[PDB]
Amino acid sequence: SATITQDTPINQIFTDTALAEKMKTVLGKTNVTDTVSQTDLDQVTTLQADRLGIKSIDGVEYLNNLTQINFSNNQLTDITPLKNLTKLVDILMNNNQIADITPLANLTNLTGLTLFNNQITDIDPLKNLTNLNRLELSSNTISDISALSGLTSLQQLSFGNQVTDLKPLANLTTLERLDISSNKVSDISVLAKLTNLESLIATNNQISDITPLGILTNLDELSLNGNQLKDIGTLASLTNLTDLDLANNQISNLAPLSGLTKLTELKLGANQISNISPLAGLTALTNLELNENQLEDISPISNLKNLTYLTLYFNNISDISPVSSLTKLQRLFFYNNKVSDVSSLANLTNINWLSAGHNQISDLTPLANLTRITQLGLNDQAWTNAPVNYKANVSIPNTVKNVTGALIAPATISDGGSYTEPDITWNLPSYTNEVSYTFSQPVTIGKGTTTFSGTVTQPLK
Amino acid sequence: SATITQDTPINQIFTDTALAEKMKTVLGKTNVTDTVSQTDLDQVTTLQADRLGIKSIDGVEYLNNLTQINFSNNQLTDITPLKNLTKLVDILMNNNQIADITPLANLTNLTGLTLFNNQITDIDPLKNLTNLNRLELSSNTISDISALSGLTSLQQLSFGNQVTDLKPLANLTTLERLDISSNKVSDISVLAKLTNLESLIATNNQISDITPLGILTNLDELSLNGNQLKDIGTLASLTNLTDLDLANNQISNLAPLSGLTKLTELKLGANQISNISPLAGLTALTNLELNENQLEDISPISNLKNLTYLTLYFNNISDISPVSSLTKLQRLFFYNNKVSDVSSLANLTNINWLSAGHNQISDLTPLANLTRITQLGLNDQAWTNAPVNYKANVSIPNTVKNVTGALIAPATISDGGSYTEPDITWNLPSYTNEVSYTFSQPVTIGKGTTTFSGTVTQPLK
Numbered sequence: 061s062a063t064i065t066q067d068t069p070i071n072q073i074f075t076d077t078a079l080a081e082k083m084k085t086v087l088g089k090t091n092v093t094d095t096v097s098q099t100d101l102d103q104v105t106t107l108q109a110d111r112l113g114i115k116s117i118d119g120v121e122y123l124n125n126l127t128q129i130n131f132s133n134n135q136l137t138d139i140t141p142l143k144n145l146t147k148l149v150d151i152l153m154n155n156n157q158i159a160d161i162t163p164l165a166n167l168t169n170l171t172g173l174t175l176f177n178n179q180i181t182d183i184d185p186l187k188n189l190t191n192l193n194r195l196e197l198s199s200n201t202i203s204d205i206s207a208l209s210g211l212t213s214l215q216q217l218s219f220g221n222q223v224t225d226l227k228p229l230a231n232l233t234t235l236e237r238l239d240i241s242s243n244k245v246s247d248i249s250v251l252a253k254l255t256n257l258e259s260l261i262a263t264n265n266q267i268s269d270i271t272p273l274g275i276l277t278n279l280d281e282l283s284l285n286g287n288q289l290k291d292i293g294t295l296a297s298l299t300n301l302t303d304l305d306l307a308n309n310q311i312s313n314l315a316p317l318s319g320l321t322k323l324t325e326l327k328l329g330a331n332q333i334s335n336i337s338p339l340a341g342l343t344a345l346t347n348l349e350l351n352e353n354q355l356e357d358i359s360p361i362s363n364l365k366n367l368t369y370l371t372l373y374f375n376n377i378s379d380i381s382p383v384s385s386l387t388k389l390q391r392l393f394f395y396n397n398k399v400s401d402v403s404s405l406a407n408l409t410n411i412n413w414l415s416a417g418h419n420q421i422s423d424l425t426p427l428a429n430l431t432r433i434t435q436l437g438l439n440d441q442a443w444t445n446a447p448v449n450y451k452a453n454v455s456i457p458n459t460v461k462n463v464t465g466a467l468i469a470p471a472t473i474s475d476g477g478s479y480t481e482p483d484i485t486w487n488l489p490s491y492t493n494e495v496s497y498t499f500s501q502p503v504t505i506g507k508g509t510t511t512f513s514g515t516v517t518q519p520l521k
Numbered sequence: 522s523a524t525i526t527q528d529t530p531i532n533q534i535f536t537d538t539a540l541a542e543k544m545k546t547v548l549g550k551t552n553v554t555d556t557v558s559q560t561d562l563d564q565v566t567t568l569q570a571d572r573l574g575i576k577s578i579d580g581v582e583y584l585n586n587l588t589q590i591n592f593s594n595n596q597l598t599d600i601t602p603l604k605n606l607t608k609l610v611d612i613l614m615n616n617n618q619i620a621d622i623t624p625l626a627n628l629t630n631l632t633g634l635t636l637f638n639n640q641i642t643d644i645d646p647l648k649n650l651t652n653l654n655r656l657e658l659s660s661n662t663i664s665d666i667s668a669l670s671g672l673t674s675l676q677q678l679s680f681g682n683q684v685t686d687l688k689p690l691a692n693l694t695t696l697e698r699l700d701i702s703s704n705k706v707s708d709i710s711v712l713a714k715l716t717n718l719e720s721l722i723a724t725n726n727q728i729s730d731i732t733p734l735g736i737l738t739n740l741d742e743l744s745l746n747g748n749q750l751k752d753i754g755t756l757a758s759l760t761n762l763t764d765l766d767l768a769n770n771q772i773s774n775l776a777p778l779s780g781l782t783k784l785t786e787l788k789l790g791a792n793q794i795s796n797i798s799p800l801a802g803l804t805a806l807t808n809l810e811l812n813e814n815q816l817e818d819i820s821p822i823s824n825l826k827n828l829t830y831l832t833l834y835f836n837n838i839s840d841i842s843p844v845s846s847l848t849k850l851q852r853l854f855f856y857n858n859k860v861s862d863v864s865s866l867a868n869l870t871n872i873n874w875l876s877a878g879h880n881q882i883s884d885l886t887p888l889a890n891l892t893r894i895t896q897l898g899l900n901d902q903a904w905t906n907a908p909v910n911y912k913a914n915v916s917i918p919n920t921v922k923n924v925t926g927a928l929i930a931p932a933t934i935s936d937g938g939s940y941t942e943p944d945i946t947w948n949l950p951s952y953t954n955e956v957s958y959t960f961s962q963p964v965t966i967g968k969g970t971t972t973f974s975g976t977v978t979q980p981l982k
């Protein structure tokens with residue numbers, strides 16, 4: 061029956077036990093076998109039933125006056141009980157396993173519909189929901205967005221993950237925030253028509269041509285990470301950008317960014333950058349990511365005195381001293397570089413995460429007073445000493461120093477060699493071109509703990 | 522392949538996009554296409570991936586060193602990727618849609634397994650998990666618990682929802698906390714063997730005989746609500762009870778509770794209680810529920826001066842004044858009684874929820890200084906006046922008074938009658954045995970708002 065005709069136990073109406081328990085509370089009852097009438101059911105206008113392990117919403121069709129529901133983070137598959145709930149204005153049902161959204165098709169009073177991370181492919185049922193202003197369909201398996209073409213009140217939209225053809229967006233000029241992350245898009249030409257866009261998230265697509273963005277001057281947040289960008293000249297137009305993510309592309313020429321002085325967050329990791337001089341004027345930056353590039357000279361960063369978070373890992377940097385002037389720096393990552401001298405880092409007392417593994421660091425004494433550290437990385441240093449002559453009996457000084465200034469004794473020594481402060485000594489009865497040793501010393505500075513370890517190579521001439 | 526043989530993109534290993542995104546963060550990467558090695562995967566020992574909209578855990582089989590996982594509140598169905606993760610000690614996977622737990626069968630290092638609110642019927646796969654000390658299977662569709670019989674290290678157990686036969690519990694004498702709520706149990710005789718039980722939750726079963734509990738003197742928490750209890754004499758043995766729920770039964774004789782002086786929470790709603798004198802000595806009570814009984818004389822509650830929460834709704838109480846001495850009372854519910862005089866409630870200034878609809882209340886002035894109220898209910902009062910003689914022209918005084926002391930004018934008047942302060946007047950040209958009027962006045966006291974409304978009936982002699 062489409063109505064409750066006699067006072068009926070809650071657990072006969074709501075057959076999912078988790079929903080029945082929720083409804084007991086909502087309906088002001090004390091046991092799921094308590095009876096309710098249609099009138100009692102009609103009092104319910106909102107339902108926040110997220111995270112409850114609900115697998116079925118059978119029974120919800122009797123809650124005729126629902127206007128807002130949240131069933132996010134459940135196990136919903138079948139949503140047919142919503143079909144006739146036409147007073148619904150907002151639905152939150154992200155993080156379920158819904159595939160068939162035909163039951164939404166006549167819910168034309170919907171203004172908000174959140175369905176991200178379900179199993180939806182066919183969005184044709186959304187075609188007539190023309191009052192929508194928020195529609196979230198990211199992390200689904202949609203390939204065809206034709207059904208969106210009439211949704212001309214949309215302000216916020218996302219969808220995924222199989223879309224190639226964006227042409228159905230052409231008339232959606234109200235759009236302000238668009239998230240097309242994780243699709244199969246190369247052609248973003250339609251986006252030039254969406255001149256009200258303030259946020260465009262397009263991570264992990266196949267985009268190489270960003271000229272469509274040139275007239276999108278309202279953009280303040282742009283994520284194009286994980287694409288195929290190289291020429292970013294278009295971005296020079298986008299002077300309202302404050303949050304720009306360009307990581308995992310093929311970019312080398314940063315000159316188009318030089319005038320983007322509102323930027324506060326700039327992500328440029330995993331590109332082909334060797335020259336950051338165009339960044340020198342971006343003095344509002346608080347977060348800058350430059351990992352996995354080809355950097356050696358980082359002197360331009362010294363200008364960026366609002367930085368609190370900086371990544372430089374996986375470069376070819378030997379001179380880290382430009383960061384020494386960044387007083388607000390809280391987290392600094394430069395593992396996998398060629399830094400030997402960390403004397404300049406003694407300045408940085410606001411530092412709480414200092415990650416410097418896989419460098420050429422031999423002496424921790426400059427770090428000794430960095431007592432606000434809570435996370436620390438110093439594993440797997442390596443350096444090669446200047447050569448000395450092969451001799452049958454060769455000695456070199458141990459140079460490895462802990463934070464206290466004490467020498468750290470070798471952990472292993474090659475070629476049968478041995479320690480006694482201060483040298484490492486080898487007897488080499490055969491001709492030999494190299495010897496080496498390692499060290500491995502746990503250390504804590506402030507509250508941050510790591511192993512300071514490394515391999516020292518000594519060429520023999 | 523059962524191993525990762527070459528550095529492999531995270532999103533090729535973890536095919537569920539939500540899990541891949543989580544794993545990107547766990548593995549210290551910045552894009553789901555970043556590559557990882559088997560060694561990187563082997564660093565992961567714990568995973569907290571609840572509430573993420575994960576539908577598949579494909580890929581988790583490569584995380585060989587996992588010992589603790591939380592995948593609660595997702596959409597998991599198939600858990601075969603766990604089969605060979607034999608270093609697992611704790612799994613939290615409540616609130617999914619798992620049915621087949623065969624993949625757990627060789628995870629013999631498990632000490633904790635939480636699976637409540639899934640779709641599990643067959644628990645035979647748990648048979649050899651003899652190191653379990655916590656096993657949560659409530660809100661499933663289990664009928665046969667034979668597989669539990671060997672799980673002799675269990676301390677905490679729950680299961681549901683089709684169990685009738687509890688005999689497999691007989692040897693589980695380590696059990697301290699058992700939750701058999703929402704099954705089909707009538708025979709709890711086996712429970713007499715579980716003499717270490719401190720908590721027994723058995724809500725919504727078919728229990729009428731609780732004599733098995735007589736030797737379970739370690740019980741401090743007992744929930745038998747929603748059963749078929751009448752004789753509760755056995756409970757007199759259980760002197761360590763502090764939290765006792767007996768709502769929705771057939772109980773009338775409370776004498777067995779009189780010596781349970783550690784009780785702090787006692788729920789007795791929806792029984793056949795008319796005499797609460799046996800409760801008078803339970804002075805540690807902070808919460809007492811007596812709704813839906815046959816109470817008239819509540820004088821014994823006056824002894825219960827630690828009460829903060831009291832329900833009395835759906836009784837036959839006319840004298841509410843015994844509650845006036847309960848200074849700590851925060852929430853008081855007595856809707857659907859026969860209370861006319863609330864003068865005594867002026868004492869209760871700690872009151873924050875006062876629910877008194879469907880009484881005989883005509884004058885709110887005693888409530889006027891209850892300014893800590895935040896929730897208030899005064900709807901649908903009704904009373905019948907003492908009769909007056911039929912006359913062709915009949916008048917009676919309006920007695921309905923708001924918190925301010927002002928008379929509240931009638932909203933409707935029967936039989937064509939009319940108001941002018943102070944009487945309601947009728948012209949009755951035919952013989953008439955009754956007239957009536959209603960009132961309906963929104964009111965706020967402190968921060969609590971309600972409609973003070975009612976129907977006043979005047980018999981004519």
Ligand SMILES: [Ca+2]
Pocket residue numbers: 090
């Ligand atoms: Ca309750």
Ligand SMILES: [Ca+2]
Pocket residue numbers: 551
């Ligand atoms: Ca990041």
Ligand SMILES: [Cl-]
Pocket residue numbers: 334335
């Ligand atoms: Cl250059």
Ligand SMILES: [Cl-]
Pocket residue numbers: 795796
């Ligand atoms: Cl009696």
Ligand SMILES: [Mg+2]
Pocket residue numbers: 303325
């Ligand atoms: Mg951002």
Ligand SMILES: [Mg+2]
Pocket residue numbers: 764786
């Ligand atoms: Mg309790």
